[PDB]
Write a protein that binds this ligand. Sequence first.
Ligand SMILES: CN(Cc1cnc2nc(N)nc(N)c2n1)c1ccc(C(=O)N[C@@H](CCC(=O)O)C(=O)O)cc1
Ligand SMILES: [Mg+2]
Ligand SMILES: [Mg+2]
Length: 264
Amino acid sequence: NPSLIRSESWSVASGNEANLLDGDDNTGVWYKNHHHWESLAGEFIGLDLGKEIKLDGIRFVIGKNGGGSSDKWNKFKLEYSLDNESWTTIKEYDKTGAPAGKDVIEESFETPISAKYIRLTNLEAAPAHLTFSEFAIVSDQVQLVESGGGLVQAGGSLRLSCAASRRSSRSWAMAWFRQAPGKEREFVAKISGDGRLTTYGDSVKGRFTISRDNAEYLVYLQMDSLKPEDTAVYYCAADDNYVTASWRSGPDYWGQGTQVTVSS
Ligand SMILES: CN(Cc1cnc2nc(N)nc(N)c2n1)c1ccc(C(=O)N[C@@H](CCC(=O)O)C(=O)O)cc1
Ligand SMILES: [Mg+2]
Ligand SMILES: [Mg+2]
């Protein structure tokens, strides 16, 4: 009956966290981050075992069924604790360049490790889009989602990132739009499938830049020189026609939206 522990900065984008304890490798959770476009060193997910136990091994399934955008940390460690303050490392991992999808992390401890907490902890900046499927111990319907957002001051910068739950063989234009409170949703930027064509709304051109990385399968919106009238919820969207990707009616998929607030 362990329970889940994880970084408080994360938000659930799909699934529910009971799926990480149900004994099923094919159910999981996709996390995002409304405060930052990267998952940074120190973020973690794992188990509070509820008491001390002599651990003989672990089986943690990271990633989750299918393809899609980058979904796993590149460098991270397995570490454990008795008091939830002092951690000891068991193993470090470098999975840089791994394709999307499940990775079953199965470890056996020749001599038992006494712990009440055990977790995977990020070592290096990675996209803030992470999926996990299962956390266990041993003891004797494409969806787009945006990360990044929050409060920044005028003259400051913020970057947004959008990931997808599946990969397509087709070429999709991607676009950002935004809606300020009780104003019509408005086009912000679009980019063609191969990245070579971009266009911007009049009021952001020369301050915002759209770009994409088709290997990570991410689309970005770099927002520089921020102004109070950039305050809005920002949505990423996908359209199989670059011409209509700037129209409200064009896109076939829309993200969940992320609040951006620019104060004076
Ligand atoms: C819009 N798109 C998401 C998508 C596409 N290009 C991207 N490109 C970048 N750089 N970043 C993204 N977030 C991104 N997202 C889609 C659209 C359709 C299907 C989809 O229908 N996939 C089928 C296969 C059919 C197909 O290949 O279209 C499946 O079973 O996964 C997947 C992703
Ligand atoms: Mg599961
Ligand atoms: Mg279409």
